[PDB]
């Protein structure tokens, strides 16, 4: 009888997560792009101004499907998120739901940082241990649990 308890991924400390070297990989998602636009900050230069390090953004196919699905009010968001500076993942699961796609994607790798803004996703991300989220705030970004913010 096969039980399955996932081991704590061995590039993690107690909660320090030494696998997050300063060239970062972030996970952009949908209402974070929308709030970045309606707070009028940029994306790559905004992340650089918040983290003082070179950040590579990533968007998944599930989040791109959500951004296409949300209609023509966010054509600015879609034109911004088809940026050649960002990269793109490729998901393989059923149901384009950004929340469980994101939190599954990060809890089986523990190396991405999650750039989110909605309440349930922030709650699940800060529930699971040792991955940093960032969010919009005022006219800049804000990091929640990176060990070296400065």
């Amino acid at each position: 009888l096969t039980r399955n308890i996932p081991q704590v991924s061995s590039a993690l400390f107690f909660q320090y997560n030494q696998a997050i070297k300063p060239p970062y990989q972030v996970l952009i998602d949908t209402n974070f792009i929308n709030f970045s636009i309606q707070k009028k900050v940029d994306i790559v230069r905004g992340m650089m101004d918040c983290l003082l390090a070179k950040c590579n953004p990533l968007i998944t196919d599930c989040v791109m499907a959500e951004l296409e699905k949300l209609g023509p009010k966010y054509r600015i968001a879609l034109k911004l998120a088809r940026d050649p500076r960002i990269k793109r993942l490729s998901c393989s699961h059923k149901g384009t739901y950004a929340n469980d796609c994101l939190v599954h994607r990060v809890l089986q790798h523990k190396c991405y940082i999650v750039a989110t803004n909605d309440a349930g996703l922030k709650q699940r991300i800060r529930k699971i241990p040792g991955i940093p989220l960032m969010s919009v705030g005022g006219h800049a970004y804000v990091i929640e649990k990176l060990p070296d913010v400065f």
Binding site: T2, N4, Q7, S9, S10, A11, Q18, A19, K21, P23, Q25, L89, S90, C91, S92, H93, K94, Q108, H109, K110, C111, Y112
Partner: protein
């Protein structure tokens, strides 16, 4: 502990083909195909069966074999069953291919490829002993020049030490692996990228797999035996990926 002469029970494991050797301290043990001769110097259990016959078993030293550490750390399912055909990208010498061979058994085959030459002659001198393996001394980056001699393997396995790991396994699996077939790769982080660290390079490699249509399903790290490798198990979907 585990000296030469103790009596050890041989219990079967979940992965059919391998066995647990439970003494006062446990071992992982595969049933030897050619009895009487160790291949890389490992210790051998030797049981008797009733016309009296005597069959022997080899231990599986996980500090010197790759997938033994994944087996002992506990993988959900491999694809190396006792009947399948198994391709072995980056067969170094006998030291792991003999274990995969006698897991596979007398019916299935193991096609072991290798690029270097001196491990090639060691592999051939081992390969004359048991018959279920095929030694190939060709580069794993060119699966169109040993396409003559193999066909339609049922699970591939990968230990090559090159930073185009995903391209190697993608080309060999498109050329040879059947649909709904297994692919077990073993990435070495410090080998394929020295700059950025282990979880980032693992996520980049598994993203390259799910771009090359292998749907991955297991990632294990095998930390107490080797450092910063990982075993990534996947299926080859090709039809209904999601």
């Amino acid at each position: 502990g585990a000296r030469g002469g103790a009596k050890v029970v041989i219990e079967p494991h979940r992965h059919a083909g391998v066995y647990i050797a439970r003494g006062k301290e446990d071992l992982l043990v595969t049933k030897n195909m050619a009895p009487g001769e160790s291949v890389y110097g490992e210790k051998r259990i030797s049981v008797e069966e009733p016309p009296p016959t005597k069959v022997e078993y080899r231990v599986w030293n996980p500090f010197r074999s790759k997938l033994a550490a994944g087996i002992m750390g506990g993988l959900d399912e491999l694809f190396i069953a006792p009947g399948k055909k198994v391709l072995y990208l980056g067969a170094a010498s006998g030291t792991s291919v003999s274990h995969v061979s006698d897991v596979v058994g007398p019916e299935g085959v193991v096609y072991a490829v290798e690029f270097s030459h001196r491990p090639g002659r060691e592999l051939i001198s081992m390969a004359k002993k048991r018959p279920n393996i095929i030694p190939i001394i060709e580069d794993a980056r060119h699966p169109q020049k040993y396409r003559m001699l193999i066909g339609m393997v049922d699970c591939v396995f990968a230990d090559v030490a090159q930073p185009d790991q995903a391209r190697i396994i993608a080309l060999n699996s498109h050329m040879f692996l059947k649909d709904q077939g297994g692919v077990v790769i073993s990435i070495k982080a410090n080998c394929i990228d020295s700059t950025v660290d282990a979880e980032t390079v693992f996520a980049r490699e598994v993203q390259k797999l799910r771009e090359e249509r292998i749907k991955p399903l297991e990632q294990l790290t095998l930390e107490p035996y080797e450092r910063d490798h990982c075993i990534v198990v996947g299926r080859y979907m090709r039809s209904g990926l999601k």
